[PDB]
Amino acid sequence: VPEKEAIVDNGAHFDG
Amino acid sequence: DKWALYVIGQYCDQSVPDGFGGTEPRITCNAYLTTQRKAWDVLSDFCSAMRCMPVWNGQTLTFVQDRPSDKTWTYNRSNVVMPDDGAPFRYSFSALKDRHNAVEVNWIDPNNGWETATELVEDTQAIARYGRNVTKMDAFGCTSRGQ
Amino acid sequence: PREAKDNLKSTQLLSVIDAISEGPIEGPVDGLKSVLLNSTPVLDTEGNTNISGVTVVFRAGEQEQTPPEGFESSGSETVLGTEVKYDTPITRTITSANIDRLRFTFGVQALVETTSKGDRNPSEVRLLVQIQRNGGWVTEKDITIKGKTTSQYLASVVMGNLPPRPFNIRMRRMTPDSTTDQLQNKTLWSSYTEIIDVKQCYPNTALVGVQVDSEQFGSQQVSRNYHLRGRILQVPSNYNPQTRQYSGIWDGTFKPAYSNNMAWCLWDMLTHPRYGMGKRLGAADVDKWALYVIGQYCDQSVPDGFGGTEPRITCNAYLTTQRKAWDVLSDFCSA
Amino acid sequence: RHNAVEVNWIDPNNGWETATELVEDTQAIARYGRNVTKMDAFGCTSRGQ
Amino acid sequence: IQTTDNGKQNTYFSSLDNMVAQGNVLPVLYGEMRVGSRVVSQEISTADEGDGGQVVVIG
Amino acid sequence: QTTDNGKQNTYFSSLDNMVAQGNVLPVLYGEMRVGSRVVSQEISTADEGDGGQVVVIG
C-alpha cells in the first residue's frame, strides 16, 4: 500500500 | 551503507508540525541505553523508530526506508514455480483481534521531570465501526509528544 | 503579641459518581441504612442520621433515567499536591479531548509574618496561572491572598474557552521566597479538575453518586461501600421470588422480578440482548424448560449446617472482570 | 483423586471477604493419605452451600 | 496573656480514589453482595466563608 | 539550661549501593538527565572539636 506515508504525516484521504 | 544512512538522516532532520503550534525535527534520538541488549534487537528498535527495515545484504548491512520506491519487480503465473496442486501464490490474513486502531506510545517527558509518559493515539473512524482494539509500544529515542 | 484571630477558612465539597452494575437493578437493601462511608452506615439501625453534610442520590438502571441531581456538570480530577518555588514553574498540558472549563486549586502551608513582641501578621503572597497560547505563556489568572492561617488554606479559580487540546497550562509564584523563619508563605497547587459541562444520565447503569462537605466530615478520601441487591431478571411467571414457591403448570412466559435463583441468572447471562449473549444466541436456543427444572432443583430446602434451612443453591456474584463467555457459562453450570 | 478440598466463598459476616471452608472424606484419607486441592464455589455466599 | 482562638481549621479530602480507566467493562451484580466503588466522575469544588474576599483574581 | 551550646553534627546515614560486576557501562545519546552509577564511594571523617578526646595505641 504505497500511499501510506501520505496518510500518516499528511492526514490525506484514502478509502477502504 | 553510509549513503543510505545519509539519506535517512536528511529525512528524519525534516521540519514537521510540533503539535503545540511550533515546528520540530521529525525524528531525533535522546536515549540512555542502560542494559546489555542483543545487538540485532537494538539495531531493529533504531531502524523501527525511524521508518526503515535493516537489510543484511549478506555482504554489507543497509536500510530500506518504508516509502513509495520505484524499481518494482513483477511476478505472474509464468514466473513462480507451479506445485502439483495448482496454487502458485498462497495468501494469509492477519486476525481481526490483531488489527489495532488505538495505541499507547511510551516516551520520556522532560517537562514533567524525566519520567515515562504515555500518549494515546486512536483512529476514530476505524473505532466507530470495527469495535476498539488498543495496544502498547515504546518509541525508541522519544522525548517529544510530536515524535 | 500573637496573630489576627481567623481570616482565611474555606471548605471543600467532593462530588463522586460510582457506576456499579448494569441494567435495571433492585438497589440498596435497606435504603440509606446500607451505604457505609469509611465503614459506618449513613443511618444506623434506628434511622438516626449518623453522618452530616452527606448527600447520596441513586439511579437504578432504567433506559429512561434522569440525570443524578446535585451533579450539574460531570468532570475528572487529578490530585498532584506539590510545592511551587520562585524560579520553578509546573506545566501539565491537559490533552483531554472534550473539556469546557478547567479548575485550579492552589493554597499555602501557612501565611504568618512575625516581628518583635510576638505581633504575628498576615503575609499577602501572590501567584500566576498561565496558558501556552500560540507562542509563549500568557496570564489567565493572577491571585493575591492576604491573611495568616497556621495550616493549609486552599482556594479555587476556574476558566472557560481553553485552546484546542494538545493543550498547555502552567502555575508559578512571584514573591521572591521564604529565606527566614519569620515569614513563611510557601505555595502548593493541590489538584486541578477538568469540567465537561454536560448533564449525562448513563442510560442503563446503576450509578450511586455521593457528595460530602468536609467541614461536617473527617477528610479520609470518603471510601464508599454500598450493600446493594442485583439485577431484576426475567424469572418464570408463577414463580414467587419471596417464598421460592412455584404455583402450577408454568406454560413459559417470564415476568420481571429481582431473584437469587441461580438458574434464572444463567438465563439472564445467556439471553440478555445488551450486555449478555442476546446477539449471538436468542431466547429459542436456550432450553428454558431444562432451566425451569434446574431452578426448581436450586430452590429445594436443605440443612444449613448450623441448624436452619436455606435454598440449595443461590447466586450472589458481582461479576466484575470480563471473561470468555463459555468459561462463565461453565462456572455457572458447575455451581 | 483429591480427597479433601479447600472451597473459597464470600462470607457476609466477617465483612464481605474470602473465607475457605475445608471439606475432607476421612474414610479415604485414613487409607490413601491426604490430597488437598483448591476450588472456588461460583456464586456461593453461604458456608453451607 | 491574651489567648488566640485561631478559629476553625479545614479538612480538604487529602487522598482521592482513582478513576476507572477505559477498556474496563461495567460489572453485573446478581442478588445481594456488598460492593465497592467504580468512580466515573470525581470533582472537588472549593468555596470560602472567611470574613470577606481577601483573594483577588484578574482577567 | 545554663550551657549545652553546640551545632547538632549531621552524618550521611543511607548510601547508594555500588554498581555490581557485569553491569555494562551505558551509552547516552543526546540530552536526557541520568541517575547515578556509583563506582567509588568513600566517607572520610574528621574532628574540629575542642582538643583530642580519641586515644589509639598501635
Numbering used by the authors:
A (entry chain Z): 592 to 607
B (entry chain Z): 297 to 443
C (entry chain F): 11 to 345
D (entry chain F): 395 to 443
E (entry chain P): 164 to 222
F (entry chain h): 165 to 222
Excerpt from the publication:
Bacteriophage lambda’s tip protein, gpJ, plays a crucial role when attaching to the cell surface. The gpJ protein, comprised of 1132 residues, is located at the bottom end of the lambda phage tail, serving as a key component of the lambda baseplate. The gpJ trimer not only seals the tail tip into a closed cone but also extends a central tail fiber, providing the means through which lambda phage directly interacts with its host. Genetic evidence has identified the E. coli receptor LamB (ecLamB) as the direct target interacting with gpJ during the phage’s attachment process.
When comparing the TTC structures of phage lambda in closed and open states, significant changes are observed in the structure of the HDs of gpJ. Subsequently, the FNIIIs dissociate and reposition themselves perpendicular to the HDs, inducing the transition of TTC to an open state. HDII-HDIII, the insertion domains HDII-ins1 and 4Fe-4S rotate away from the tail tip axis. Alignment of these domains with their counterparts in the closed state reveals unchanged structures, indicating a rigid rotation as a whole. The HDII-ins2 domain undergoes rotation and determines the narrowest diameter within the HDs region in the final DNA channel. In the closed state, gpI residues from position 101 onward are resolved, but in the open structure, only residues from position 167 onward can be seen. The gpI segment above the gaps descends, inducing a loosening and dropping of the plugs. In conclusion, the upward movement of the FNIII, the outward displacement of the HDs, and the outward movement and loosening of the plug domains of gpI expand the diameter of the tail tube to over 3 nm, a size adequate for DNA passage.
